[PDB]
């Protein structure tokens, strides 16, 4: 039930999503090992993901959380990178998208830094890089990230050596 609507680069929505992508790039402690060496992106396309079933699933859970947290969903817009972004946009997030080995246990991970999510587009630690050239720093191959609406509710604060 998913349809993808292309945004025009002239559309304020395209522009605000691009600015969040570009402005949240940082340098990584791996020197670019996982995600590649870059300071910025070439955005090729931004599509709005439209799925009624999945949206309703989200808003139902958001109301549950909000009601458990003084009417505050604590909703954020965050990035998610994965080799399985095509499954996610069609079938939603679920336990198959959980990072079993993550620092905070087997959950679904999101980032403020788009460049953190970029480290996961080709797999954990960048996998073996792009399928075509086997290059984690490929400048040719098209990559995809999700920019996601995420309900945090009451969030457990972990101070972390990152």
């Amino acid at each position: 039930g998913t349809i993808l609507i292309d945004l025009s680069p002239d559309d304020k929505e395209f522009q605000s999503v691009e600015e969040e992508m570009q402005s949240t790039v940082r340098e990584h402690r791996d020197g670019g090992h996982a995600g590649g060496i870059f300071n910025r992106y070439n955005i090729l396309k931004i599509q709005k993901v439209c799925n009624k079933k999945l949206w309703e699933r989200y808003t139902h859970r958001r109301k549950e959380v909000s009601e458990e947290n003084h009417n505050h969903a604590n909703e954020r817009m965050l990035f998610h990178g994965s080799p399985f972004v095509n499954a996610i946009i069609h079938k939603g997030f679920d336990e198959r998208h959980a990072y079993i080995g993550g620092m905070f246990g087997a959950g679904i991970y999101f980032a403020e830094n788009s460049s953190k999510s970029n480290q996961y587009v080709y797999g954990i630690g960048g996998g073996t890089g792009c399928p075509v050239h086997k290059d984690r720093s490929c400048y040719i191959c098209h990559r995809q990230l999700l920019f996601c609406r995420v309900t945090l509710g009451k969030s457990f604060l972990q101070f972390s050596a990152m």
Binding site: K45, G107, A111
Partner: protein
């Protein structure tokens, strides 16, 4: 999938060491996120 810490709906991983890093977040229910934008891009080689 694991569970949220009791009395919580998510976890926030706050960077200690790296002063320039932003936060990361973990949810334990797939229904707590909606994939709103699909962004297709290349990384750019620094000049």
């Amino acid at each position: 999938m694991a569970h949220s810490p009791p009395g919580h709906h998510s976890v926030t991983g706050r960077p200690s060491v790296n002063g320039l890093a932003l936060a990361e977040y973990v949810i334990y229910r797939g229904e707590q996120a909606y994939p709103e934008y699909l962004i297709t891009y290349q990384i750019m080689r620094p000049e």
